[PDB]
Amino acid sequence: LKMGELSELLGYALKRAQLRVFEDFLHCVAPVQLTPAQFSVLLLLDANPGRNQTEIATTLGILRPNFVAMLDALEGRGLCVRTRSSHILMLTDKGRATLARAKKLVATRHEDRLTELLGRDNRDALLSMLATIAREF
Amino acid sequence: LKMGELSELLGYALKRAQLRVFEDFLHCVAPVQLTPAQFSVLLLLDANPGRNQTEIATTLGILRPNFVAMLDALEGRGLCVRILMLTDKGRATLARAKKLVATRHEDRLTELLGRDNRDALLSMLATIAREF
């Protein structure tokens, strides 16, 4: 195939890089069936006790309908609950076990292998120029 | 908020940069109403006269049903017909889009980051999609 002027677009490579990383993420954290978003959601609810849904969603760039959909299924699966009695969620013991198991899988097979592929200096380079993009573009 | 490990995971950073790139693209290409996938699909379908549907979708990492849905829209818009053949209007929407992507969006990326830093990014990004 003639890929033409797609090979000249940073937009394109970023999007294919993003997709590949996701597919690997998923394959690694398939013992616990978390998507990268469910992962980031459980991680932020654990690390931030006493903060409403408003703040998790907007921080991960997730839209309010979509976020409410997400939680409902996290709740459905038994990984979070609302405080009792609410708009503050808390994980459950299973939630923390799913999160801990997932940081394990994420760090071991996935992130390290990714890191070796490029080395520290370039991984660190990439984290930088990606962060500059989301913040400043 | 306490982001924790997110701060330095590559998947998270790549999805945030990706999300913002798509948003900006969508804005500048708004006067032709293409997502980056559709733009990519017309570009491919223009630059590859004769090449069959199944060669395009696999190259762009799109499942077969999803692809059919995209084409139905484009064709419904008058941008192509059925192997796939970009129309006149398809050809003019791509030509507008091409300028808009190239003169309102990608150069401001390179401008943001630097002429050496942006090239380096493309190549490292390309290295993950290919090898990882």
UniProtKB/TrEMBL annotation, chain A:
Set out the biological process GO terms recorded for this chain's protein. Answer: response to stress
- Coiled-coil intervals, chain numbering: none
- Where in the numbering of this chain does the HTH marR-type domain appear? 3-135
Molecular function as annotated in GO: DNA-binding transcription factor activity
Query: What's the protein name?
Result: Transcriptional regulator, MarR family
